[PDB]
Amino acid sequence: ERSSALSEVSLRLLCHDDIDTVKHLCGDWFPIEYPDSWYRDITSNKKFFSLAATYRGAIVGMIVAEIKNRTKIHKEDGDILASNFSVDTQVAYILSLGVVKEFRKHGIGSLLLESLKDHISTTAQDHCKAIYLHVLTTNNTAINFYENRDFKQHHYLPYYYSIRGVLKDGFTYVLYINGGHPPWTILDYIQHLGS
Amino acid sequence: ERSSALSEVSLRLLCHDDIDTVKHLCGDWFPIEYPDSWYRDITSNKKFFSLAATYRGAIVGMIVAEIKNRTKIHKEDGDILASNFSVDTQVAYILSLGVVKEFRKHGIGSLLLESLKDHISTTAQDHCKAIYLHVLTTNNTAINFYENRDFKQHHYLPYYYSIRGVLKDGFTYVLYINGGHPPWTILDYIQHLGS
Ligand SMILES: CC(C)(COP(=O)(O)OP(=O)(O)OC[C@H]1O[C@@H](n2cnc3c(N)ncnc32)[C@H](O)[C@@H]1OP(=O)(O)O)[C@@H](O)C(=O)NCCC(=O)NCCS
Ligand SMILES: CC(C)(COP(=O)(O)OP(=O)(O)OC[C@H]1O[C@@H](n2cnc3c(N)ncnc32)[C@H](O)[C@@H]1OP(=O)(O)O)[C@@H](O)C(=O)NCCC(=O)NCCS
C-alpha cells in the first residue's frame, strides 16, 4: 500500500508555501518551539540546503542543513575538528532530518542524507571536513540510523538551565569526510608515530 | 509605606517550603520554564547558596548561586578566565538574582549580592576568581545594576535553536575577584611588558 513508496518519491527544495507543513512535520518529530522566523528562514533562505522528499507530491520527509566555516560552530562543539584544520575549513550542520513515521524504513532518510553528501561535494569539494548534528538522548531510532551510517558519537551535551531558556540533554554526532578528524591527544600521536 | 522596607528585611536560606513562592517570583522576572526538579534542587540542595530576603517575613528577593571549579563552566563561557588559572580555580555562577518590583531600589539587591561576596570569602577564600552571570539583552535595569557594581560585559551569547530547545540571546557578565582576569592577547602582554 505504502510498500512501494520510494518509487513514488521526488526531491525538491523547500519554499515559503511549505511553512505550515514544515511546522506540522517537525512538531511531530520534536517537541520544540521554533519561532516563525526560523521556519521562514529555513524554507526561503538559500544559505540553507533545505530539501524535501515528497510522496505522491506531498512532503513526507526533509533534510535541512547549513554549510559553514568552522568558526561558526558553537563552542560546545568546537572540538569536533582538530586545531590543524584551518579557520577556512568548512562543516555542515544538519538542522533537521526527519521522515513521517508511516514512511520510515523505505529508504527516504538515506536518500536525503546521500543528497546532502552529494550537495556538499559539488558545493564545497574537499573543503568541508565534517557533517555534524544533534540528537536527543531519547532517540534510539535516529541514533541507530546514524551509527549505521558511520556517524560517531562525539560527546554528550548536558541539560542547560538558564534565564535564556532550557535545553534538554543530547549527543553530538559527527561524520568525518575529506580527512577530517577530532583533536588528537598525546597518546593518539604516540600511536601514529610509535607504530 | 514601603519606603522603610530595608529596615524590615531579614535574610534566610531558601527551603523546600518556598518552592511555590520561588516559582511565582522567578516567573515574574523571567519567562522561563524550569522543571520542578530545578526548583527542588535550588531550594533544598546545599551545593547551592540560596538566600532569600524577606520583608515582614515574606520573601521579596533572592539570590541563588553555585561555587564550582572552573572545569564546570559551560564551554560558551570557558574563556572568562585566562588559562594560567589552574583547573582547581573556582568561580561562582549566579543562577538567579531578583527582587520584587515594588521593593526595588531599596537596597535589597545590593544586600543579596554583598552577602554572596561574603559567603565566597569565608567559603572559598582567594581560590574563587570570578563571579559570573547571564542577563537577557532586554534587561536594561539589571545591566545597569551590575555595571554599576563593577561587573563587565564579557561577551554576547546568540540565540540558540536546536532539537534540544531554544535559547534567547544574552550577555555574560563577570566580576573578577582575587586577581582573576580573562585571557590576554598578544597586545595585552605587549602592553604589560612594554610599559
Ligand atoms: C532517522 C529517520 C530519519 C530514518 O528515516 P528512514 O526514512 O527511516 O530511513 P531509511 O529508510 O533510509 O532507513 C531506515 C532503515 O530501513 C532500511 N530500509 C530501507 N528501505 C527498506 C525497505 N524498503 N525495506 C526494509 N528496510 C528498508 C534501511 O536499510 C535502514 O536500516 P539500517 O539502518 O539497518 O540500514 C527516521 O527514523 C526519523 O525521521 N526519525 C525522527 C528523527 C528526528 O527526530 N529527527 C530530527 C527531529 S526535527
Ligand atoms: C537588578 C535588581 C535585582 C536590583 O535590585 P534592587 O533590589 O533594585 O537593587 P538595589 O536596590 O540594591 O539597587 C538599585 C538602585 O537603588 C539605589 N538605592 C538603594 N536604596 C535606595 C534608596 N533607599 N533610595 C533610593 N535609591 C536607592 C541603589 O543605589 C541602586 O542604584 P545605583 O545602581 O545607581 O547605585 C532588580 O532590578 C531586579 O530584580 N531585576 C530583575 C532582574 C532579573 O530578571 N533577574 C534574574 C531573573 S530570574
Numbering used by the authors:
A (entry chain A), B (entry chain A): 5 to 199
The paper states:
As the first N-terminal acetyltransferase discovered on an organelle, NatF, encoded by NAA60 and also named as Histone acetyltransferase type B protein 4 (HAT4), Naa60 or N-acetyltransferase 15 (NAT15), is the youngest member of the NAT family. As an N-terminal acetyltransferase, NatF can specifically catalyze acetylation of the N-terminal α-amine of most transmembrane proteins and has substrate preference towards proteins with Met-Lys-, Met-Val-, Met-Ala- and Met-Met-N-termini, thus partially overlapping substrate selectivity with NatC and NatE18. Another important feature of NatF is that this protein is anchored on the Golgi apparatus through its C-terminal membrane-integrating region and takes part in the maintaining of Golgi integrity. The structure of hNaa60 protein contains a central domain exhibiting a classic GCN5-related N-acetyltransferase (GNAT) folding, along with the extended N- and C-terminal regions.
The crystal structures of hNaa60(1-242)/Ac-CoA and hNaa60(1-199)/CoA were determined by molecular replacement and refined to 1.38 Å and 1.60 Å resolution, respectively. In the hNaa60(1-199)/CoA structure, a part of the α5-helix is deleted due to truncation of the C-terminal region. Interestingly, the remaining residues in α5-helix still form an amphipathic helix although the hydrophobic interaction with the N-terminal hydrophobic groove of a neighbor molecule is abolished and the helix is largely exposed in solvent due to different crystal packing. Upon removing the C-terminal region of hNaa60, we observed that hNaa60 (1-199) molecules pack in a different way involving the β7-β8 hairpin in the crystal, leading to about 50 degree rotation of the hairpin which moves away from the α1-α2 loop. Interestingly, in the hNaa60(1-199) crystal structure, the displaced β7-β8 hairpin opened a second way for the substrate to access the active center that would readily accommodate the binding of the H4 peptide, thus implied a potential explanation for KAT activity of this enzyme from a structural biological view. However, since hNaa60(1-242) and hNaa60(1-199) were crystallized in different crystal forms, the observed conformational change of the β7-β8 hairpin may simply be an artifact related to the different crystal packing. The electron density of Phe 34 side-chain is well defined in the hNaa60(1-242)/Ac-CoA structure, but becomes invisible in the hNaa60(1-199)/CoA structure, indicating displacement of the Phe 34 side-chain in the latter. Interestingly, in the structure of hNaa60(1-199)/CoA, the terminal thiol of CoA adopts alternative conformations. One is to approach the substrate amine (as indicated by the superimposed hNaa50/CoA/peptide structure), similar to the terminal ethanethioate of Ac-CoA in the structure of hNaa60(1-242)/Ac-CoA; the other is to approach the α1-α2 loop and away from the substrate amine.
